[PDB]
Structures are given as C-alpha cells and as structure tokens.
A paper describes a structure:
In the gliding bacterium, Mycoplasma mobile, a dimeric F1-like ATPase forms a chain structure within the cell, which is proposed to drive the gliding motility. Structural features of the ATPase displayed strong similarities to F1-ATPase, suggesting a rotation based on the rotary catalytic mechanism.
The twin motor exhibited a rectangular structure with dimensions of approximately 350 × 250 × 150 Å and at least 24 polypeptide chains with a total mass of approximately 1.5 MDa. The F1-like ATPase comprised a hexameric ring of two alternating subunits and a central shaft subunit, identified as MMOBs 1660, 1670, and 1630, respectively. In the hexameric ring, nucleotide-derived densities were observed at five of the six subunit interfaces, despite the isolation and analysis of samples under nucleotide free condition, indicating the presence of endogenous nucleotides as reported in F1-ATPase. The subunit attached to α, forming a “bridge” between two α3β3γ subcomplexes, was identified as MMOB1620 and named GliD in the present study. The three densities protruding from the G1-ATPase dimer were identified as MMOB4530, which was previously annotated as PGK. In addition, at the interface of the two G1-ATPase monomers, the N-terminal regions of G1-β3 and G1-β6 interacted with the NBDs of G1-α6 and G1-α3 of another G1-ATPase monomer, respectively. GliD contained a globular domain and an N-terminal long α-helix (H2), which was only visualized in the dimer. The two H2 helices in the GliD dimer aligned parallel to each other across the H20–H25 region of α, GliE, β-NTD, and β-CTD.
Residue numbers in the entry:
A (entry chain U): 45 to 49
B (entry chain J): 125 to 159
C (entry chain O): 179 to 344, 348 to 385
D (entry chain E): 1 to 528
E (entry chain B): 202 to 771
F (entry chain A): 589 to 686
Amino acid sequence: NYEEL
Amino acid sequence: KIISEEKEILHLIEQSKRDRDFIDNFSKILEEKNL
Amino acid sequence: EIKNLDKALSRPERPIVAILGGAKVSDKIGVLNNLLKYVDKIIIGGAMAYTFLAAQGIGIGKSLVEEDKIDLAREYLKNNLDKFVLPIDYALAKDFEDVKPFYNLENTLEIPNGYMGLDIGPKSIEVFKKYIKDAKTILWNGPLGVTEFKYFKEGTKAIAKAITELVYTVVGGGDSVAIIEELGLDRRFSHVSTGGGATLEFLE
Amino acid sequence: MKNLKITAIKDNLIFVEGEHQFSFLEIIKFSDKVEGVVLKANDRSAIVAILNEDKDLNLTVGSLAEATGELYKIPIYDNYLGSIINVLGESLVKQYERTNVALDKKYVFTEAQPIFTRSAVNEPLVTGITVVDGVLPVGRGQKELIIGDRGTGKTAIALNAMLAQENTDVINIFIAIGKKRDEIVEIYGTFKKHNILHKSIIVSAASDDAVAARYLAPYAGMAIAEFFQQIGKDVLVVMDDLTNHADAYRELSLLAGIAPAREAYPGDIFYVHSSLLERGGKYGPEFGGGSITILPIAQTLAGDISGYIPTNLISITDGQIYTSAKLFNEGTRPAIDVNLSVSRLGSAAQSKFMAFASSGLKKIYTEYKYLKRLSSFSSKISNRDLETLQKGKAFESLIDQAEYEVIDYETSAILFLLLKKGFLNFYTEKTEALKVIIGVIKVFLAKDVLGRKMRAILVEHGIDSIVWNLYLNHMILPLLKYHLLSELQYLATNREFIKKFKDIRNDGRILLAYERKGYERGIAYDYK
Amino acid sequence: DPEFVASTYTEEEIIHNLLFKLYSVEQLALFTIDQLNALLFARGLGLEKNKVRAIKSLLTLQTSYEFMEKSQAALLPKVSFNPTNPLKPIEEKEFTIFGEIVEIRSQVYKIRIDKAEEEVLPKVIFYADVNGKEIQLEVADIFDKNLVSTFVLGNETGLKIGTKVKSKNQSYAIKISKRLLGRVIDPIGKILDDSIATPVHGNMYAPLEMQHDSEATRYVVSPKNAILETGIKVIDVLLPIPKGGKTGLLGGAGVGKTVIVQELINAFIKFHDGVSVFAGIGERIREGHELWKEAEALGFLNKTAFIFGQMNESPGLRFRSGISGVKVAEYFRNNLGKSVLLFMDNIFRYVQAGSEISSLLEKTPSAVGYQPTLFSEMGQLQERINSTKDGDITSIQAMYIPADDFTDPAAVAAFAHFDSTIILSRQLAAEGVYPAIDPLESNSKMLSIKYTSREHLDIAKKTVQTLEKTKTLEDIINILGFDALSEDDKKVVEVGRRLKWFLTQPFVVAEKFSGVPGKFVRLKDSLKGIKTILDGDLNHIPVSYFSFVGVVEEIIEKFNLDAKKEALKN
Amino acid sequence: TKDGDITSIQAMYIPADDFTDPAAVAAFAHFDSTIILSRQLAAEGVYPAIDPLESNSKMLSIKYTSREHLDIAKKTVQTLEKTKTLEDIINILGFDAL
Ligand SMILES: Nc1ncnc2c1ncn2[C@@H]1O[C@H](COP(=O)(O)OP(=O)(O)OP(=O)(O)O)[C@@H](O)[C@H]1O
Ligand SMILES: Nc1ncnc2c1ncn2[C@@H]1O[C@H](COP(=O)(O)OP(=O)(O)O)[C@@H](O)[C@H]1O
Ligand SMILES: [Mg+2]
Ligand SMILES: [Mg+2]
C-alpha cells in the first residue's frame, strides 16, 4: 500500500 | 516557514548549551570582586 | 506476428521487463493499463518521463511536459509504486539545437532552469544496463532519448547494445523498428511490429 | 683542447686545476679511454673520481686533462643483448658482434617523468614462484624490494623472476654492484642454459672495480632500460644489490670531503636511491607506452631491518619480499616470510582468474601459522582446528619449489583452486602426487590444443565459478585421477581419495591407450 | 522576487544549491530505488538497498538544522563573507640582487653577489635560467656581505660554475585562488596534471610568511570543542576526531592508511560540504597518479587541492610541501571563510627531508643522526593548524613508524601535537578485518564528558572492556578448549566476537578490491547497534553474519532470510 | 682458470664476538662456504665448535651433490632448529610439558 510507505 | 518554531527553539537551546560549556571570550566568566 | 503480440502475451516467463520509449505521457495510457496488469517492471524514457518527474515533484526546467496527465501519473504511482524505473541522469542543452551536452554533476535528478531534457546520461545508461542484465523478456517500443539529434542518440545505441549482447528479446514499436533499421538492432529482437495504433491496440 | 692539469693525487681521487664552468658529475677526459666525474668543484679547481684505469696511461702531477662540459652519456649498441658490459659499454663477454654505430646515447642521470605521463599498473609480471604469484603479486611497472639476510635465497628469487620470462616479451637487465666475477659468469651460464640469453643484458661492476663505476652502474642500467622502454617494450630490472651501491657512494663522499651523517652516509643518500627508483613504472602511449619493473635487493644484518639503507629502501618501494633465515633452517624453499611481506598493489596486479583462485590464501596461512606455533603448548583442538591444520599443511606443501623452477601462472591458479576446494589434503609428506599433478597440468595447458584454448580463456578472460567448476569436473579431475592412480597405486586405498574421487568419469582406458602410443603425460585430445 | 534573488547567484552557485532542496515525504514515497540512490549519493549518505530505510535516512539528513539552514539560505540573495584579517598577496618588486654560482656540490651551491640594490635576507629565492628552464635556490647561510649558500628547490641538473642568478629578495611564492581546486601542483607551483601546463589563476602568496601584526594575535585561538563525523563505526564510537585539532594515522606498510585517507576526503567533501587540501610529502609517483585518477573517477576531484612533493625531488622541495598545503588551507579559511580538512602523508618523510637538509648544509647531527631543530620544525609545521572565528582547519596526518619503534625521535616529535591517534595493525588486517583499526591501542582525547554524552562514554567504555576481556579469554580457549570457560565467560566471549566483527565496514572507495558497495553509518546508528549487541540480544546469530555490514538491522534481516530459505528447502 | 685451480681456506677473526662488524660484513660477500664458530658450543665442550644454524654453504646444490645428501643435510638442520626451539620450553616450563 502507498500509505504504509 | 522552512524551519519550524519548535526546531528553532531546540537549536537555540543547543547553541546556548555550547556557548555556556565552551567559552571563547574570557570576559564571559564570572569574577569575584575584592572587598 | 501472433508469436509475439498474441502468443507471447499470455504466459510470459518471469522475470519480465518492458521498455517504453516515447515523448508523450498521454500517448500510451492504455498501454500502461494492460502492461501493469501484465508486466511488473517497466523502463520509461522520453518526454513522458519528464512529465512523470514533474508529477513526482522533481524540478523539470524548460523541458516539454503534459500538464493534463500529471494527476494521472500521480495516480499510476500511488496505486503501484515499485514497478517503474525512471532514469536519474539527464544530458541537457540550452535549446533544441544538438550542441555539446551539459550535465548536472550534483543532484543529477534536478533539471535546472534554462535547460530541457532530451537524452539520458551515463549514470542512467549504467543503471538501465544493470536492470537489463537480470531479465528474461525484452519488449522495446520507441526511443527513450531523442534519436533525431546526433548529440542525443547515445542512449538508444547503448541500450540496444545492452539488449543485444544478452531469455527472449523482441521489438513492439514503430519507432523502435525505425531505430533498429537505422542502427542494426535485430541481433536479439526476433521481429518488430511497426503497428502504431495497431501495436497500441494489441498492447492494450 | 686540454685545459686542466693535475695538482694532487689522494685516495685515488684526482685534483684538477684550471678555469672552467664545472658542473656536478661532469665528465672529465684524461685520454681516449680514461675519464672521471666531478664530485666537488670551485671556480678554478675540482675533484674527480676515475671511472676506469688504463695500464698504458700513468696519471701523475702535471698531467693535462680535458673538461668535456657535458655529463655522462651511455651509448646503446647492437650486441648488448646476450652480453656482459661495463658502465662504459665495453663487451666483456659477448655472443655477437658490434656494428660500432650506436643506436642512441642516453643520459644516465635523467629525471623521472612526472605523474601525468604514467598509467595504472594492471598487468601481472609472472615471477614463476607460486607464493609470489598468488599471495604477493607483482605487477608490470611496480618496484618490489627483496630484503633479507645472507644466504637466504634473494638472488635465486630474482633469477627465477628473470627465468620465468622465457616465453614472454619482457626484456631482462641484471645489474651487479660489487659482486664476484665467478658468480656473474655462473649467472650468465644459467641465462644461456634456459634460452633467455638472447634478450638479457648484464651490467657488471665487480667488487674490485673503481668505486665510481660501482656508483654509476645502476644508473647506466636504468638508462638502457629507458632506451628499451621508449620504444614500447616491457623491461624487468634487477639490482643486486643496493647496499653495495650505498657503500660505494659513502666511500666516494668520505674520500671527497663530505661531512658524515647517520651511519657515516652522506646527507643525500636517500635522494640518490629515490631518484633512481622512481624512474620505473608504467607509462601512457604518449610517453613511450612501455613499463619498467624493478627488483632491488637489500641485505640485513641478523634480521635488523632498522638500518638506515633498509629503511630508505622500504620507504621508497611499493612492496617488500622478506627472506627469513629461520624459515631457511626449517627447510622452506624459498624461505619467504609471508607474514612480513607486503604488496600494496594486490589483486590489481593479478589477472581475474588468478584473483579468483587466490581469494583467501593469506588468511588461511596466518591462521595455520598461529595454530602451528601454539600446537607445541596446547593439547585440545577442535575439528575446525584439524581442517585448518590440513589446509595449512597443504598450502605449505604447495608453495615449496626447487631452484630455477618456473611454474606457470595458470598452473599456480589451478593448484590454488584445487587446494581451496579441499582436493590436496589426502597426501602428506610424499609430495610426489603434487609433482605429477604439476606435470600433468603443465602438459595439458602447454601441449593439448584444447588445453591451449583453455589456457587462453584463463589468461585474458575472467570466468565465473560455474564455468571453472565445469572445467574442473570434466577435464582436469579425470586426468588427475587417472594419473594419480597410474603413478601412486596405494593412493586408491586412501579413504579420502576414494571419497573425493568417486563421482568423476573413469577414463582410464583411453588414457592408457594414449600412454601405450607414447603421447607424453597430459595430452588428453589429439584431434589435430 | 525570484529574479532578484537568482541575480546574485552564478549558474554554478545555483547548480550547487540544487543539492539543498527540501523534498516532502509525500513526494519521497513516490521515488524509485534508482532516484533514491542518486539522491543519497549526491548528498553523501551512501547507497541503500531498502526503500523505507532510504527515505528515513534522507529525512534524517534533511531534518538536521544545518541542512535546513542551507536550504533556507539557498532561496535568498547572496550574502558575501566579509574577510577580516585576509591573506595579503606579496608586493610587486623588481629583480634587485644579481650574482653567480661560485661553488658546486651535491644539492648545495654557493652564490657570490655582484650587483645588489639591497642586502640579502635569509630564506630568499635566487632564480637561474638554464636552457629556458627556471631553477629556484633557497638561501640558507649568509657568510658575509656578498657570499651566500643555497639549496635547490626541485632539480639541480643544468647548474654549473658561473651560472647567473637573480633575486627579488623574497621567499618562494605560489599562486593561490579558488581555481586551485581540481588541479595538481608541486610545492613551488609547477603544474603536474598536464603536459601543456595550463596556468592557475590567482594571487601570489608567500607560504613562509605568516602575516601576523603581533605575537599576541597567535594566542587569539579557540580551543577545540566539536567532533567531526566520519561515518566510520569504529572511529565515531571509540576514537572521535576533533574539529580543529590533529589526528595521526599510524602503522607499518600496507596497513591501509591511504584508503582511509581517500574515504575521509570523500566524506568531508560530500557529506560535510567542505573544501579538502591534500599535501603529499615524499609522495610516490605511482600512488599520486592512482589517487588523482580515483579522485577524478569518484567525483571529489573538483573540490580538492592537491600539492605533491614527489619522492624523486630534492629534499628542499620535499620539505616545502607541508608548508604549501598549510598556506592553501589558511587562504581557504581566512579569505573565503570555509572550513578546511587538510591531509598530510607522510609526516615521517617530512621529518626525513628536514634531516637531509640539515645534514647537507654541514650541521652537527643530533641523537640518532637527526637534525638539531627537529622539535622546532615539527612545531613550525603543526602550529598553524587551529580553529578561529573564521572557520576550522582539521588535520588528518598519516605516519609511518619504522619497525614499530614508537620511541623513534620522529614519532616522539609527532605525538607532541596529535589530538587523536589511530593505530593500525597488520595482524588485524591479515585476519581480513577492515578498516583494521586497533581499538585497544588507539585512543582519543575527545572521548570525555566535556564533548560527548553519558551514553556514548558508557558504550565506549563497555566496548573496550569487553574487547580486552575477550582477547584475554581467547588464549584460554585456544589452549584449554572452549569448554574450560565458565558460563559467564562464554557469553562474554561471544559478545566480544560479535562486537569485533560488527566494527568492520565496507568503504565506497574500497570497491576496487572486494567489489562490495560502501556504506555511511551515522553515530546514532552505530551506538544503537553496539547497544543491541552488548545486551546479548543478537546472541542467536552466527558470527559470519556480522561481518562487513552497515547497521544492526541488516544482520537480523539476512539471518531471517537464511532461516526462511532453510525452512523452505527441507 | 683453465690453467689450474686456486682453493682458498681463510680464517676470519670477529672482534668482541660482534658478527655485525663491518669487516665481517665485507668478508661475508666473498666466501662460497661460510663456517661460523660459537663460543657457547666451545664452552659446552663441542669440538669443533661449529654452529650449523648460523653457517651456510652454496655447495649444497643439485649441481654438486646427490639428492640423498641434500635431503639428509636439510633434515639434520631442521631437526637441530626444532630441538633448539624446544630446549627453551624445557628450560622454562620443565620437561613434562612436552
Ligand atoms: N628454491 C630453492 N631451493 C633450494 N635451494 C635454494 C633455493 N633458492 C636458493 N637456494 C640455495 O640457497 C643458497 C643461497 O642462494 P642465493 O645466491 O640466492 O642467496 P643470497 O640470499 O643471494 O645470498 P648472498 O648473501 O650470498 O648473496 C644457495 O645454496 C642456493 O642453492
Ligand atoms: N578498507 C579496506 N578494504 C580492503 N582493502 C584495504 C582497505 N584498506 C586498505 N586495504 C588494502 O591496503 C592496500 C594498500 O595499502 P595502503 O592503503 O597503501 O596502506 P599504507 O598506506 O598504510 O601502506 C590495498 O591493496 C588494499 O587491499
Ligand atoms: Mg646474492
Ligand atoms: Mg599510504
């Protein structure tokens, strides 16, 4: 996921 | 706006600590006055 | 014919890597869709690469862009992020004239004002060669640089040599077919499509 | 033309009076054959050291002399190769005839070329010694000192280095400073026997030659080397030895009247060696495109490397090969101290195959030496200790070779890889298995046409581990297995030999047939 | 006013200022591995093989106050450093003294003066012209009014009796400016990096003139108070380098000093964003060429000023290399207000050249044949490196100890000035341990509470204690076997082994030998890793995993990956 | 020369038992065979007091002797060196440590 990065 | 106020306060604290610990100008050291 | 566009588009052997060389971000959108749901690792070169750099927030200088699809690039990076390999080094010139190139030695990502991007630099060449070395399928489509200029065609010849010296390589673009004909790049590629809109539809 | 006259003769040094523009080391001519160099000078007088003497001419007070105005220039002649010569170019022992038309004249005291004329040293100079080739690499253009006590085998190492160039394109120049004449003649005979005489020059200044001649011999040798390098050649230079050269210079300086310094050597004893040794290196195509490799020799007293001259020579050179008397007593040949020797160049001076073959040999040797030293006191050792002892013993047995024995670069690399794989620990104290292995590998790489192809692949191509493993498991191991069985019969009874050699093709029939037809040991294919 | 603020900056200044650009984390998540690695290499943090770790490193570098200060200043009109007490160039004179050579020898020539407009001064330079080549002779002794003695600065070939010489009654001078960066010269200013000898544009300064109004000015100095960050785990944790002091690199031959020197040059130029001056004394031609070529290749050539007194040059020329390097550093601090990291190699050769010059000029040798003015000359060299209001001059000097004799007079003279000594071991290098720094023998004066924290001191003390104790116990292990240890001794030995192997590090310059990419480890990361190892947390990992890594997490990740592969294999 | 041989046997004196004396160093360069006598061995009663661990000979080559002689000489010198090393251990740590 983009948000996890 | 690049530097936040909190980080500026931290930098001021660190610079004050450095200026207190290591003194370059000898007129900044407390002297006892003869009486 | 069908042995590449149809037969080879069903059960590719991992790892699979694709190269798209073009000067328009909004000229290959659909291709991305079928590519991202088919191929994981993709090289991107050209003016659409500079559009992607503008989307990411990097400086672009006086390079040609497509301001309409900036948010489209942001969306294609947000959903999938560890897929694309954009170049780092960019040979630059003051204007469109093919003059002796100039480089940004420090912070190679940034493109300063008064310069436009036309071709990738030696660091980008080396990193692309490193990515090419570990591969099993090659799908070349278009020039990552600007082939029409003499002082801006080193990238295409270097990547062609890298793809040919070392697994199956092919060509899937009319511009790639032209570059191969003008440079002799059929040593490793089985065949070229030159489909244009037909190639885009077969790749969509 | 003569304008100087002799006024005194003290300590074999001539004192000349006359009005001239004297310069340091200027040549003063006393006759057609006799000449000297200026050590000190005034506005009207000078001190001259004679280079050579003539029986006919007897120099006295009042004899006239001519000041040439130039420094010493050595002439280059056709028959220098395969010859022993003076510092003046006279053929003491020659193999061919001299045309008497000099090809060139070189200044013996030329300044070294600056840093922009050099190129990176990246090619291996094959010494012919396994331990030097693998653990202490020497590259073309690298000055490498050989330092040790008397009778430890330094001259032997240098001679091995020159003999290993039999099949290469390197030119050998041997400079003898204060050496015995019989030893020089024996070295010339050794050159002749090994067919390296046609490209070797010896510049000889014996122990009873004039001191100026002994001082100038290395400079003349390096001038000849520079003549050969300026036309793009590779040259290997051996100086034997620079301690005698320093002694000769000290004698000259003390006789002249120069104030003594540390150990009574003149003040500039470091300069005369640094300026001499910095003239060797690798050069770019615009400045000759050649290379000069220097192997100076230095003698220490009871292992004391703290002397002035050894310290200077260690500070100047790129690496040091130490010869130990204790290792000579222990039976090591050559008695090279690996723990003390250093090579700053490293794998940069090795081929890719050799670098891959000798990755971690120094660490294994160090661990083995530590364990062997402590073995006389310890009682309990782990299994890793047993494997370390086996590998170290195999390494010691591998790096031992006879005198004037050249071992090929690729043979050394293959032996190193065999050791690293564990294939050389079955034998012990016999060292005939390793002898037949070396013979087989040399014949395979030198005679068999496919062996020649493999040799080229190993020389100019750096192969990966898989390709080398395929080579080892398909041609080397079967040949070694068959010939080890055929010449060491009891080896088959060894459990380790049977274990390591149970998954290799048994090609004994065809190789026995080739033995019957008379093919020499090592030719596996005759596909002409 | 973007146009106005950009009007005060040259195009090269904008190119440099593109480095100090702030990137938001939202943008940073969208970069690729290749772009992140390019950014890290441009900012000197070294390559990273993980995404989130690279973003964290970039954010940590960007969140620093100095980086934010530079980024904020990069969007403002140029402010010029106003030089107080600059270096004044030499004055313009004519050739006022004329004479000729009357006595010759090896390296020493006597000059008789015929036509003089003024009396000759000590240390002035006489110029001679032979075959279109210029030779400089430095004056040593003035015997009477019209007779002096001189020694050559360079090559003495071509000099003879009656060679006319002329002098301006001035010491030797060199051309200094910012254009000296990226060029290679010798102490007297001769070009050494090309055959056509493209000149260096600058002003002529005399390196032997200090330009002090009074001696009291030499006591207006600021004692060292700061620690320079190098990115090397062992140096940062155990041997802090003073900023404005002196660090000695000691060892035998082949220990690896020059690789450390190159790594420190690169780290100072890239990470610390400064100016580097290299002064080779008795520099081998091959090593000088190699170091120049790798400086060009690695990209720190354009910010380094090289001075090379070569090994084959006269001792007088070899002696002046340190003075010329010090003068260049003084110019780069006083005139431009930039912190300079000055590198010296090799100090032993400087001492040897001084001894040679003393012996040549007929002076009575001191003990062990050294010059009577040994300590005086060492002080003369080392006393011009200091820290003043204008900036810092840090020195990192490599020394060769002959036969490991630390009581040699040259070494005894050198230790009088070193603020931190880093001693390399040939045994430790032979074990494959690099950078092969001996932690027990080396020590730093900056590992106190005046400069470091309580945590740093505690970690350093515990590390040294553990290493000494495991060194003691290893002999017992070797003799009596690993079983003879007690229960606590086994844990101590394992912790010590893992600590010793964790201190190794791959350098970005040493990629030529082993082919392994280098790394840059911050002080906090090294402290956290050593703290984790000291507690015994990673005692379940084989020792082979601790070798040549960057941070503590790499070992854990590699061990977890190997365990996963082993679990999948069966 | 071809007219005949001149075989030289020479005795060299070592002042103050200092084998680094310049005269000894100069003489070492000319001896094909070098035989060094020890004062400690003579004190122990060994006669001749020849120290084989300090001497050397260039006639120990395959060009002049057989393989067996070379092997025997090398083994003898190696054994004497090992014994000399072990005598220090015996002297300090006693005999039962071996
Ligand atoms: N590889 C070798 N195997 C066996 N003997 C060897 C070997 N190398 C040298 N020797 C022997 O060692 C002795 C010394 O040889 P060499 O002339 O090389 O010594 P050196 O160190 O130059 O001595 P010196 O001080 O007399 O010049 C000779 O007897 C020679 O035969
Ligand atoms: N960090 C390192 N990694 C690998 N090798 C090194 C390292 N540092 C030094 N070396 C080795 O040292 C050799 C060069 O020695 P050098 O740096 O000149 O040491 P010194 O200058 O102290 O003699 C090289 O061959 C290299 O292999
Ligand atoms: Mg010899
Ligand atoms: Mg060094």
